Design an enzyme around this catalytic site. Structure first.
Site, PDB file in Angstrom:
ATOM      1  N   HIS A 111     -13.278  -8.271  -4.824  1.00  0.00           N
ATOM      2  CA  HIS A 111     -13.078  -7.472  -6.032  1.00  0.00           C
ATOM      3  C   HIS A 111     -14.199  -7.658  -7.047  1.00  0.00           C
ATOM      4  O   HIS A 111     -14.426  -6.773  -7.878  1.00  0.00           O
ATOM      5  CB  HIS A 111     -11.739  -7.824  -6.678  1.00  0.00           C
ATOM      6  CG  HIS A 111     -10.565  -7.630  -5.775  1.00  0.00           C
ATOM      7  ND1 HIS A 111     -10.287  -8.476  -4.718  1.00  0.00           N
ATOM      8  CD2 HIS A 111      -9.597  -6.684  -5.768  1.00  0.00           C
ATOM      9  CE1 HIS A 111      -9.195  -8.059  -4.102  1.00  0.00           C
ATOM     10  NE2 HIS A 111      -8.757  -6.974  -4.720  1.00  0.00           N
ATOM     11  N   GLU A 167       0.813  -1.205   0.000  1.00  0.00           N
ATOM     12  CA  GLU A 167       0.000   0.000   0.000  1.00  0.00           C
ATOM     13  C   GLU A 167       0.855   1.266   0.000  1.00  0.00           C
ATOM     14  O   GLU A 167       0.526   2.236  -0.692  1.00  0.00           O
ATOM     15  CB  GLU A 167      -0.951  -0.026   1.192  1.00  0.00           C
ATOM     16  CG  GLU A 167      -1.918  -1.238   1.223  1.00  0.00           C
ATOM     17  CD  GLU A 167      -2.766  -1.394  -0.045  1.00  0.00           C
ATOM     18  OE1 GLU A 167      -2.877  -0.427  -0.816  1.00  0.00           O
ATOM     19  OE2 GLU A 167      -3.324  -2.488  -0.279  1.00  0.00           O
TER      20      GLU A 167
END
Ligand SMILES: *[C@@H]1O[C@H](CO)[C@@H](O[C@@H]2O[C@H](CO)[C@@H](O)[C@H](O)[C@H]2NC(C)=O)[C@H](O)[C@H]1NC(C)=O
Ligand code: NAG
Ligand code: NAG
Lengths: 597, 192
Positions: free
Chosen positions: A487, A357
């Site tokens: 997702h 991230e």
């Protein structure tokens, strides 16, 4: 004036209103994602309605500035991103229903509970809870209950919603002159820039499929080896020539095999390359995990995290009554506001994710210099790949020892090398077929090759053939197992995780040569090479301003996915694997299932 | 007879860049120590003069210009610069003599929900000459014809700054005071 001068001023208008409207949208999304409330859902939907309404009117206006009459590539590329709109082209009722479907699908997924039969009062969310079972449990029944109970409670609800979703998403794609919503998604890899740097949407399928052919032998052996070692943990449930039961793969989907590491480590008396227990014993917290990742990026020359990052991010679940969506994400809210939302645990996985991230942020921070329309990754795979170059270094025994998670008397031999390579393989090689097979199924649904009546027939047929994984329970067309992945329920494309994994090592091979590393590239720690960070930041700062084929050719030598660096990185584990499997069967029969027994 | 720098620097309201305001300082004693030993100025650049020697200098008049800009535009309040602020709002001459001071005002000038009161001009035919000011609010067209929005290729020339309390530092509001020092063949009225 010139059509070029009119479009430059049009873009300057666009940039100033969009900066405002997309910032308010990002803020409204952050509060929902950080604080799930009815009031915040309405506030999120409204701010995104203003952003969508703006965005679509600007797309129409952009067409009056025809591309052929502008000569400056930067403006020409800014206008290209504006030419194709989105869901605006739908009937107001029609885009009403699709926005409703996406909000329901997302909150079904984050509010879903499956209840224990033996204890009907104990009801578990996915995160945390069902995930804890699917990562740390070794009981076939406990995992099966969670696996099946998830696909049965929320999978079954999502099925009618997913059917409406494809019909509407395809109606929006065809209205924009794409073949289907899958074609629309592949547009991200489309490159029309310069000469020889051209890439079409249809090449992505050919290229994904050609490179997956080269990965498959290494995966078949990784598969054979973990199947052998799971028979030590699940005797009377594993068939040594069959597919692997899907609830025993180490997470809710078998997306990553990393939590099989304990059950599959070759040399377990050696110092543990999984530093999760060393992190706990040194009282690391989520802050320390993010500070260590910040320290890494600073050592290669990249900037530190902004002060607003440390104040505004959500780095652990708050546990103050607020419901959060826990899926790790890195936000560029605009106006230099960079944040991470993550429910961080003290784990080597979350240690590595926090590097992943932070690389997103680092990318967003660098292409801030670019004009608004151009501040995105070169393609989606690039964006999910910057984070993983850092994990490749941060996970090496060398770097772990310099960070304190391995003892100062630690030394690398051939056994810790196979340990480290095998764990890397469980994460990075284990996920390629899972990723390939999911988007193949998605792409075929949108295209029309799989009809509703065969959606789950073909999913479990493709799972078995391509991934070597088999369902523990029969599933009718009443089910919708792929929508049980975050997702899919949340309308994100998945092939980025495939192209990323091939990009990973191409980048890593090129930065190590800049770092003047000698030896195999799995020993390489990019840490402290400012020359390497300089080479990387030169691509990061380009954003989407150049086509991704050129952007790639400017760091590494090639202008397309090359699988050769990935295979070199795993060349010692592969030769080792072949030997462990010299008197064993490599491959799988699709016929056997846990329930036809 | 102390010089009233506190009325310029500690004013409640500041103006937008395009509509920047100017106070004339004269016949006063100028103690710049209130400025140079202080923590809060993120920017304190002097031109043709040394900050440390300010209390020894004498001038005909001093001029104080107040306004507000983004953090990333404070670099444009300097001689020789270009960009929207330097071209269309506030232009320093190359032979500028004086000091530029800026400080972060997110506490006063930014909101949770967003403060849109400060504006700046981003479209103009031709750049500004130094110390010139344009407060006209006429719709802008690249051909230069008079037009009326919503028509195409026709735009309002003033943009709002959007000042939020959570933004990155280059997007946070900054108050700016530009002290110009004036050397005329007249007697001196501002000294140390
Ligand atoms: C989480 O969201 C709720 C609902 O949006 C927030 O509550 C409101 O807070 C604002 C500001 O204090 C008030 O003006 C509203 O009237 C409140 N509405 C309700 C229904 O309570 C809450 O503050 C948020 N919590 C956190 C920690 O951010
Ligand atoms: C990076 O540099 C510091 C400074 O000497 C050193 O302590 C650290 O071990 C270095 N890390 C690597 C991986 O070389
Ligand atoms: C403004 O106010 C503070 C006191 O609140 C003071 O220290 C400062 O000197 C005043 N004047 C100037 C010019 O900053």
């Amino acid at each position: 004036s010139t059509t070029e001068d009119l479009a430059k001023t049009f873009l300057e208008k666009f940039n100033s209103e969009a900066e405002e409207l997309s910032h308010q949208s990002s803020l409204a999304s952050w509060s929902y994602n950080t604080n799930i409330t009815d009031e915040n859902v309405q506030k999120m939907n409204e701010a995104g309605a203003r952003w969508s309404a703006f965005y679509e009117e600007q797309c129409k206006l952009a067409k009056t500035y025809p591309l052929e009459e502008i000569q400056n590539l930067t403006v020409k590329r800014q206008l290209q991103a504006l030419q194709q709109s989105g869901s605006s082209v739908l009937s107001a009722d029609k885009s009403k229903r699709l926005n409703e479907i996406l909000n329901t699908m997302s909150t079904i997924y984050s509010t879903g509970k499956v209840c224990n039969p033996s204890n009907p009062q104990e009801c578990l969310l996915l995160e945390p809870g069902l995930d804890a079972i699917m990562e740390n449990s070794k009981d076939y029944n406990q995992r099966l209950w969670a696996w099946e109970g998830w696909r049965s409670e929320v999978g079954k609800q999502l099925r009618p919603l997913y059917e409406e979703y494809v019909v509407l998403k395809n109606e929006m794609a065809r209205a924009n002159n794409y073949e289907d919503y899958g074609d629309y998604w592949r547009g991200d890899y489309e490159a029309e820039g310069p000469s020889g740097y051209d890439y079409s949407r249809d090449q992505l399928i050919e290229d994904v499929e050609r490179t997956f052919a080269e990965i498959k032998p290494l995966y078949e052996h990784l598969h054979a080896y973990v199947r052998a070692k799971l028979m030590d943990t699940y005797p009377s449930h594993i068939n040594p020539t069959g597919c692997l039961p899907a609830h025993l793969l180490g997470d809710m989907w078998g997306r990553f095999w990393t939590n099989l590491y304990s059950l599959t480590v070759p040399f377990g008396q050696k110092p543990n390359i999984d530093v999760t227990d060393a992190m706990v014993d040194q009282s690391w917290d989520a802050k320390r995990i993010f500070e260590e990742a910040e320290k890494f990026f600073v050592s290669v020359g990249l900037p530190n995290m902004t002060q607003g990052f440390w104040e505004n991010s959500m780095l652990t679940e708050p546990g103050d009554g607020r419901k959060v969506v826990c899926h790790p994400t890195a936000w560029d809210l605009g106006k230099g506001d960079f944040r991470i939302k993550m429910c961080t645990k003290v784990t080597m996985d979350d240690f590595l994710t926090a590097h992943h991230e932070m690389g997103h942020i680092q990318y967003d921070m660098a292409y801030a210099v670019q004009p608004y329309l151009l501040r995105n990754g070169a393609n989606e795979g690039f964006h999910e790949a910057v984070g993983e170059i850092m994990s490749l270094s941060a996970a090496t025994p060398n770097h772990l020892k310099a960070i304190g998670l391995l003892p100062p008397d630690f030394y690398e031999d051939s056994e810790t090398e196979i340990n480290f390579l095998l764990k890397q393989a469980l994460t990075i090689v284990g996920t390629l077929p899972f990723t390939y097979m999911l988007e193949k199924w998605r792409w075929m649904v949108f295209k029309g090759e799989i009809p509703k009546e065969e959606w789950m027939k073909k999913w479990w047929e493709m799972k078995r053939e391509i991934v070597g994984v088999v369902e523990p329970v029969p599933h009718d067309e009443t089910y919708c197992d792929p929508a049980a992945l975050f997702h899919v329920a949340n309308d994100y494309s998945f092939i980025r995780y495939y192209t990323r994994t091939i990009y990973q090592f191409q980048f890593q091979e090129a930065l190590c040569q800049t770092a003047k590393h000698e030896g195999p590239l799995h020993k390489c720690d990019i840490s402290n090479s400012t020359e390497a960070g300089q080479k990387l930041l030169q691509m990061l700062s380009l954003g989407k301003s150049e086509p991704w084929t050129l952007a790639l050719e400017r760091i590494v030598g090639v202008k397309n996915m090359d699988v050769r660096p990935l295979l070199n990185y795993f060349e010692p584990l592969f030769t080792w694997l072949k030997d462990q499997n010299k008197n064993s069967f490599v491959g799988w029969s699709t016929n056997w299932s846990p329930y036809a027994d | 007879n102390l010089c009233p720098f506190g009325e310029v620097f500690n004013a409640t309201k500041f103006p937008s860049v395009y509509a920047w305001e100017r106070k004339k300082i004269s016949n006063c004693v100028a103690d710049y120590s209130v400025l140079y030993n202080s923590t809060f100025f993120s920017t304190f650049k002097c031109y043709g003069v040394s900050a440390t020697k300010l209390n020894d200098l004498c001038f005909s008049n001093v001029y104080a210009d107040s306004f507000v800009v983004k953090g990333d535009d404070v670099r444009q309040i300097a001689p020789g610069q270009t960009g929207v602020i330097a071209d269309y709002n506030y232009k320093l001459p190359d032979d500028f003599m004086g000091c530029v001071l800026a400080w972060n005002t997110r506490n006063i000038d930014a909101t949770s929900t967003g403060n849109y009161n400060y504006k700046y001009r981003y479209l103009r035919h031709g750049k500004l000459r130094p110390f010139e000011r344009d407060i006209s609010n006429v719709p802008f067209s690249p051909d230069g014809k008079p037009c009326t929005p919503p028509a195409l290729n026709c735009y309002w020339p003033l943009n709002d700054y959007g000042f939020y309390t959570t933004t990155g530092i280059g997007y946070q509001p900054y108050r700016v005071v530009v002290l110009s020092f004036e050397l005329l063949n007249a007697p001196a009225t501002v000294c140390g």
